[PDB]
Design a protein around this ligand. Sequence first.
Ligand SMILES: Cc1ccc2nc(C(F)(F)F)cc(N3CCNCC3)c2c1
Ligand SMILES: Cc1ccc2nc(C(F)(F)F)cc(N3CCNCC3)c2c1
Length: 283
Amino acid sequence: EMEKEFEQIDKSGSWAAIYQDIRHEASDFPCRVAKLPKNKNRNRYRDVSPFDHSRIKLHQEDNDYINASLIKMEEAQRSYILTQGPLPNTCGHFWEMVWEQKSRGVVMLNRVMEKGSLKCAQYWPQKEEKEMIFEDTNLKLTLISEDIKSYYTVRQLELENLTTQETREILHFHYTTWPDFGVPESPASFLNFLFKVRESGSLSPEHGPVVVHCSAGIGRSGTFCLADTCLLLMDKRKDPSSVDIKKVLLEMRKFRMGLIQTADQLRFSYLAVIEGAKFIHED
Ligand SMILES: Cc1ccc2nc(C(F)(F)F)cc(N3CCNCC3)c2c1
Ligand SMILES: Cc1ccc2nc(C(F)(F)F)cc(N3CCNCC3)c2c1
């Protein structure tokens, strides 16, 4: 079915109309903590905030606030943490969250710089011999190795809690080739990247939730979790054509606002689910 709906929407040029519908219908819940005066320098964008009911709380009190949300999908039996790209003053909070929530993987869907503007802090070490220390949260981070490919990079990191000298292996999955403008023409590399994350075991119930981000933590990040979930649901259910991608996206929007930011991103998500279901000189 999904193939044939996609065909009609493309023919009618109705992606923008469907997208405005999703926006009109979405949930609204309060975000009072995000809006406190003391939290102004913890938010990259004033119009992207976590709902109170689903925000992640830091355990090192004094201030428990981080721009991050728990997306808990009940039928699919998978959880994710969606967060903004860390700021220069929130990298310590980011790693504190990964530690406290027992995450095994971090998924990054942007480059630090795009279009000559900073989108995310350099929150991980680029060289084995030059480790990072976060003095405010008492954490050390070391690059162990990396595997660089044409469309994405996988890094092995070691995260140490200095208060206890406990260490843990964290996998960093970095999609390095999403366009400055628009979306990928083909979802093939996006699909190979998802399979890599799945195959690592980073998504399994034995771990804490995977941490997923882009710059705001709602657009590209939304496409990742929406596609993962719908593909889980295509497998679990007896007719995969029962899976309503609009309905799934509305359910996820109960836990974080804004997920999928453009009509182009909504079409790509459809596209990625249609293609992933099949496995289960101008310049
Ligand atoms: C046999 C098999 C089973 C499940 C798979 N799932 C995906 C998916 F995108 F992770 F869902 C991608 C998959 N492939 C991996 C190999 N290249 C194309 C994408 C895949 C392959
Ligand atoms: C045949 C067709 C029909 C409708 C389309 N609509 C969009 C839109 F941006 F999602 F509105 C993007 C579309 N794509 C984006 C990716 N490159 C081809 C144009 C599109 C393509």
